[PDB]
From Swiss-Prot:
Disulfide bonds join 3-20, 10-22, 16-28. This is Trypsin inhibitor 1. Keywords: Disulfide bond, Knottin, Protease inhibitor, Secreted, Serine protease inhibitor. Its main location: secreted. It comes from Cucurbita maxima (Pumpkin). GO terms for molecular function: serine-type endopeptidase inhibitor activity. GO terms for cellular component: extracellular region. InterPro entries: Prot_inh_squash, Proteinase_amylase_inhib_sf.
Length: 29
């Protein structure tokens, strides 16, 4: 559940660092 709250763009879930995932807005959780 390690996914600090940051708003960066993302194309796919792997694009985000840590355990974060790419949410509907196209940004990491």
């Amino acid at each position: 559940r390690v996914c600090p709250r940051i708003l960066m763009e993302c194309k796919k879930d792997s694009d985000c660092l840590a355990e974060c995932v790419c949410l509907e807005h196209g940004y990491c959780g």
